[PDB]
Amino acid sequence: EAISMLTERLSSIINAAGGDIGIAVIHVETGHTTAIQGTTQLPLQSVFKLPLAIAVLKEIEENRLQLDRKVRVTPADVMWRRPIDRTVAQLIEVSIIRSDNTSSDKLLQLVGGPAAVTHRMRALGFPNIEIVSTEREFSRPNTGSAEDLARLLVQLQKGELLQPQHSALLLGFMHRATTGTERLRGSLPVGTPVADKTGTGDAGVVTNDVGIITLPKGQGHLAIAVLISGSKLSPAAQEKLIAEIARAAYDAHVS
């Protein structure tokens, strides 16, 4: 009866927030899905670096690239004040953890640009994630639906999306995410494992967080995507909306 009424409870949390809000909550093991505007494609900001990382790792899994390939980064590509070498793995690491824009654009460069990332998402079963711009170009947003992003995270958590070492590598990066620790984690009980990737537009124009919540005991995992676009609320109140949405989803699925 909790997973039952989660939708009504979530819709009351975001009431009067304005803007466009997409929510998707999927219990990984059973597939139980709760969504509000779950198929509306909304601006991703740095959340797009998660599809990017999967696109890069699929290049490696399809014998067109390797994890330890050295890549040269220069100040002309703008940590990056000297011409430095970084492995492909190190580029994914900094792109996921610090949302680093120089490394992300080099990774986009490696896989063939935004259209190639979009094609890979389609090939993997996520036709509602549209990558159209680099970070320099956006400096027409990259958009994605909450359900597509949540379903991607389900497959990542299940071991279906990537090889096991790449899945552990990417989730490890997402565990160490340093930019949105008061979003999905903000209202969860102490000791709840969370892997996530955030996205933030300047002055509260976009507040996003997507990730995987580990439930206690053997009650499973939650894939959760919250995309907030153009809300009237303060940045802090938008982050609190994500934290409370995440806690409501947790409570509904836990005993």
Short mmCIF file of C-alpha atoms in Angstrom, two decimals:
data_model
loop_
_atom_site.label_atom_id
_atom_site.label_comp_id
_atom_site.label_asym_id
_atom_site.label_seq_id
_atom_site.Cartn_x
_atom_site.Cartn_y
_atom_site.Cartn_z
CA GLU A 1 0.00 0.00 0.00
CA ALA A 2 3.08 2.26 0.16
CA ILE A 3 4.34 1.70 -3.40
CA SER A 4 0.60 1.99 -4.17
CA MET A 5 0.20 5.60 -3.18
CA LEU A 6 3.74 6.83 -3.95
CA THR A 7 2.50 8.70 -7.03
CA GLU A 8 -0.08 10.69 -5.08
CA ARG A 9 2.53 11.44 -2.38
CA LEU A 10 5.16 12.56 -4.91
CA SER A 11 2.69 14.79 -6.77
CA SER A 12 1.98 16.57 -3.49
CA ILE A 13 5.68 17.07 -2.73
CA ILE A 14 6.20 18.91 -6.03
CA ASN A 15 2.87 20.77 -5.95
CA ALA A 16 3.16 24.49 -6.80
CA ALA A 17 6.86 24.09 -7.65
CA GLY A 18 6.18 25.36 -11.18
CA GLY A 19 8.34 24.61 -14.17
CA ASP A 20 8.61 21.13 -15.68
CA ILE A 21 9.37 18.21 -13.35
CA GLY A 22 10.00 14.65 -14.54
CA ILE A 23 10.22 11.83 -11.99
CA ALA A 24 10.87 8.13 -12.53
CA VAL A 25 11.32 5.56 -9.74
CA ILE A 26 12.00 1.93 -10.68
CA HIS A 27 12.61 -0.93 -8.26
CA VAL A 28 15.49 -2.69 -10.02
CA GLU A 29 14.64 -6.29 -9.11
CA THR A 30 10.88 -6.28 -9.76
CA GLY A 31 10.53 -3.43 -12.26
CA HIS A 32 7.87 -1.61 -10.21
CA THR A 33 7.73 1.85 -11.76
CA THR A 34 6.38 5.17 -10.49
CA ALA A 35 6.58 8.12 -12.85
CA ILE A 36 5.31 11.70 -13.14
CA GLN A 37 5.83 13.23 -16.60
CA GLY A 38 8.20 10.30 -17.04
CA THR A 39 8.36 10.45 -20.85
CA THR A 40 8.85 14.22 -21.18
CA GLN A 41 12.35 15.01 -22.42
CA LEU A 42 13.85 17.67 -20.14
CA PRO A 43 17.21 19.50 -20.10
CA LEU A 44 19.99 17.33 -18.72
CA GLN A 45 22.91 19.71 -17.99
CA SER A 46 25.73 17.52 -16.60
CA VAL A 47 23.43 14.49 -16.29
CA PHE A 48 24.27 13.92 -19.96
CA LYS A 49 27.77 12.85 -18.86
CA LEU A 50 26.27 9.55 -17.68
CA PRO A 51 25.02 8.60 -21.19
CA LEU A 52 28.38 9.89 -22.44
CA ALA A 53 30.29 7.57 -20.09
CA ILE A 54 28.19 4.59 -21.19
CA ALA A 55 28.79 5.51 -24.83
CA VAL A 56 32.54 5.66 -24.16
CA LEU A 57 32.57 2.33 -22.31
CA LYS A 58 30.54 0.69 -25.10
CA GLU A 59 33.21 1.85 -27.55
CA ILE A 60 35.68 -0.13 -25.43
CA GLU A 61 33.31 -3.10 -25.22
CA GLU A 62 33.00 -3.03 -29.06
CA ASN A 63 36.85 -3.12 -29.67
CA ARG A 64 37.11 0.48 -30.93
CA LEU A 65 38.88 1.96 -27.88
CA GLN A 66 40.68 0.87 -24.73
CA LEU A 67 40.44 1.92 -21.09
CA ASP A 68 44.15 2.70 -20.71
CA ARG A 69 44.50 4.72 -23.91
CA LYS A 70 46.48 7.88 -23.19
CA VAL A 71 44.74 11.07 -24.32
CA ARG A 72 46.47 14.45 -24.47
CA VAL A 73 44.64 17.44 -22.97
CA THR A 74 45.89 21.00 -23.41
CA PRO A 75 44.78 24.46 -22.21
CA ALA A 76 43.43 24.93 -25.74
CA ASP A 77 40.86 22.26 -24.81
CA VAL A 78 39.47 24.58 -22.12
CA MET A 79 43.67 20.43 -13.65
CA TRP A 80 44.19 21.57 -17.24
CA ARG A 81 46.88 24.27 -17.13
CA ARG A 82 49.64 22.06 -18.59
CA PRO A 83 49.53 19.74 -21.61
CA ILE A 84 48.77 16.57 -19.67
CA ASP A 85 48.09 12.95 -20.57
CA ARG A 86 45.02 11.27 -19.08
CA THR A 87 43.84 7.73 -19.71
CA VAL A 88 40.33 7.26 -21.06
CA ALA A 89 39.39 5.90 -17.63
CA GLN A 90 40.77 9.03 -15.96
CA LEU A 91 38.68 11.19 -18.31
CA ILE A 92 35.49 9.32 -17.38
CA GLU A 93 36.42 9.59 -13.68
CA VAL A 94 36.79 13.37 -13.66
CA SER A 95 33.80 13.81 -16.01
CA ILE A 96 31.51 11.88 -13.64
CA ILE A 97 32.83 12.99 -10.25
CA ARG A 98 33.63 16.67 -10.86
CA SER A 99 31.38 17.11 -13.92
CA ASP A 100 34.52 18.29 -15.67
CA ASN A 101 33.70 19.97 -18.95
CA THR A 102 37.11 19.75 -20.63
CA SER A 103 37.35 15.98 -20.19
CA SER A 104 33.74 15.47 -21.25
CA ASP A 105 34.30 17.32 -24.52
CA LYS A 106 37.38 15.20 -25.19
CA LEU A 107 35.28 12.08 -24.52
CA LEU A 108 32.56 13.33 -26.89
CA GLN A 109 35.34 13.96 -29.36
CA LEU A 110 36.54 10.35 -29.05
CA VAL A 111 33.15 8.66 -29.61
CA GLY A 112 32.13 10.81 -32.59
CA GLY A 113 30.23 13.73 -31.08
CA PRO A 114 26.70 14.25 -29.74
CA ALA A 115 24.98 12.41 -32.59
CA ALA A 116 27.09 9.30 -31.90
CA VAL A 117 26.13 9.33 -28.21
CA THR A 118 22.48 9.66 -29.23
CA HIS A 119 22.81 6.74 -31.66
CA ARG A 120 24.38 4.56 -28.96
CA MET A 121 21.49 5.31 -26.60
CA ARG A 122 19.05 4.19 -29.30
CA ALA A 123 21.09 1.04 -29.95
CA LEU A 124 21.02 0.24 -26.22
CA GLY A 125 17.25 0.71 -25.92
CA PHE A 126 16.99 4.35 -24.78
CA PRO A 127 15.47 6.29 -27.70
CA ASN A 128 14.43 9.30 -25.57
CA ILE A 129 17.91 10.57 -24.64
CA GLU A 130 18.90 13.23 -27.19
CA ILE A 131 22.47 14.54 -27.10
CA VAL A 132 22.74 17.40 -29.59
CA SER A 133 25.34 19.82 -28.22
CA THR A 134 28.82 19.77 -26.79
CA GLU A 135 29.49 21.74 -23.63
CA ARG A 136 31.31 24.37 -25.72
CA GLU A 137 28.31 24.60 -28.05
CA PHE A 138 25.95 24.94 -25.09
CA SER A 139 28.39 27.52 -23.67
CA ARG A 140 19.64 23.68 -27.87
CA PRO A 141 20.15 21.64 -24.72
CA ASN A 142 20.75 17.94 -24.41
CA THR A 143 17.47 16.40 -23.25
CA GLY A 144 16.37 13.10 -21.81
CA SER A 145 13.31 11.54 -20.23
CA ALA A 146 13.25 10.48 -16.58
CA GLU A 147 12.05 6.98 -17.49
CA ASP A 148 14.80 6.40 -20.07
CA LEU A 149 17.48 7.52 -17.60
CA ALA A 150 15.98 5.39 -14.83
CA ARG A 151 15.79 2.33 -17.10
CA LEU A 152 19.41 2.86 -18.11
CA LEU A 153 20.35 2.91 -14.42
CA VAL A 154 18.34 -0.28 -13.84
CA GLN A 155 20.36 -2.10 -16.51
CA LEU A 156 23.61 -0.68 -15.10
CA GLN A 157 22.73 -1.93 -11.61
CA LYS A 158 21.58 -5.32 -12.92
CA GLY A 159 24.81 -6.06 -14.76
CA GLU A 160 23.03 -5.97 -18.15
CA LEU A 161 24.33 -2.68 -19.57
CA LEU A 162 28.12 -3.06 -19.34
CA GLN A 163 30.77 -5.66 -18.64
CA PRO A 164 31.20 -6.25 -14.89
CA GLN A 165 34.48 -4.35 -14.52
CA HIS A 166 33.11 -1.30 -16.35
CA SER A 167 29.90 -1.39 -14.34
CA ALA A 168 31.92 -1.49 -11.12
CA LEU A 169 34.20 1.27 -12.43
CA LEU A 170 31.35 3.60 -13.41
CA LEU A 171 29.34 2.95 -10.24
CA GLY A 172 32.49 3.58 -8.21
CA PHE A 173 32.77 6.98 -9.88
CA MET A 174 29.10 7.67 -9.15
CA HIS A 175 29.60 6.76 -5.48
CA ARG A 176 32.24 9.48 -5.15
CA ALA A 177 30.09 12.18 -6.79
CA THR A 178 31.09 15.39 -5.01
CA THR A 179 28.59 17.95 -6.35
CA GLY A 180 25.11 16.84 -5.25
CA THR A 181 25.38 15.17 -1.86
CA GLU A 182 22.37 17.05 -0.44
CA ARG A 183 20.15 15.97 -3.36
CA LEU A 184 19.38 12.23 -3.59
CA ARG A 185 21.27 11.59 -0.33
CA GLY A 186 19.88 14.57 1.58
CA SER A 187 16.94 12.90 3.33
CA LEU A 188 17.88 9.25 3.32
CA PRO A 189 18.62 7.31 6.53
CA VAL A 190 22.25 7.37 7.59
CA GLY A 191 24.17 4.58 5.89
CA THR A 192 22.20 4.37 2.63
CA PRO A 193 24.51 3.59 -0.34
CA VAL A 194 23.87 5.97 -3.26
CA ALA A 195 25.47 6.18 -6.71
CA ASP A 196 24.40 9.30 -8.58
CA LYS A 197 25.13 11.93 -11.23
CA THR A 198 23.83 15.49 -10.84
CA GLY A 199 23.04 18.30 -13.25
CA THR A 200 22.73 22.00 -12.43
CA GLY A 201 21.90 25.06 -14.49
CA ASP A 202 23.00 28.47 -13.27
CA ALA A 203 20.62 30.43 -11.00
CA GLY A 204 18.28 27.50 -10.44
CA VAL A 205 17.17 27.13 -14.06
CA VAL A 206 17.85 23.36 -13.92
CA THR A 207 18.24 21.03 -10.93
CA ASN A 208 18.69 17.34 -11.75
CA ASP A 209 19.81 14.16 -10.03
CA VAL A 210 19.72 10.56 -11.28
CA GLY A 211 21.10 7.53 -9.52
CA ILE A 212 20.72 4.21 -7.72
CA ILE A 213 19.69 3.84 -4.06
CA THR A 214 20.66 0.64 -2.24
CA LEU A 215 17.83 -0.50 0.04
CA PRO A 216 18.49 -2.30 3.34
CA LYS A 217 18.80 -6.07 3.85
CA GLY A 218 17.94 -7.73 0.51
CA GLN A 219 15.08 -5.39 -0.38
CA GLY A 220 16.78 -4.38 -3.64
CA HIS A 221 17.70 -1.14 -5.36
CA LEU A 222 15.87 1.93 -6.66
CA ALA A 223 16.73 3.59 -9.95
CA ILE A 224 15.57 7.20 -9.62
CA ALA A 225 15.63 10.17 -12.01
CA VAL A 226 14.42 13.64 -11.01
CA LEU A 227 14.61 16.43 -13.59
CA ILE A 228 13.50 19.93 -12.55
CA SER A 229 13.39 22.55 -15.31
CA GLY A 230 12.48 26.20 -14.88
CA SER A 231 10.96 26.08 -11.42
CA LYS A 232 10.08 29.16 -9.39
CA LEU A 233 11.68 27.73 -6.24
CA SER A 234 15.08 28.67 -4.89
CA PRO A 235 18.04 26.39 -5.74
CA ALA A 236 18.03 25.06 -2.18
CA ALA A 237 14.30 24.33 -2.31
CA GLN A 238 14.74 22.51 -5.64
CA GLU A 239 17.48 20.33 -4.15
CA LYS A 240 15.22 19.68 -1.16
CA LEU A 241 12.49 18.56 -3.58
CA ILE A 242 14.84 15.90 -4.96
CA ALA A 243 15.92 14.81 -1.48
CA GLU A 244 12.31 14.43 -0.33
CA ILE A 245 11.23 12.66 -3.53
CA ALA A 246 14.09 10.22 -2.95
CA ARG A 247 13.10 9.67 0.69
CA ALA A 248 9.44 9.14 -0.24
CA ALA A 249 10.47 6.53 -2.82
CA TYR A 250 12.78 4.85 -0.30
CA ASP A 251 10.08 4.65 2.39
CA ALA A 252 7.48 3.27 -0.04
CA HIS A 253 9.77 0.39 -1.09
CA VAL A 254 11.30 -0.47 2.31
CA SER A 255 9.66 -2.53 5.04
#
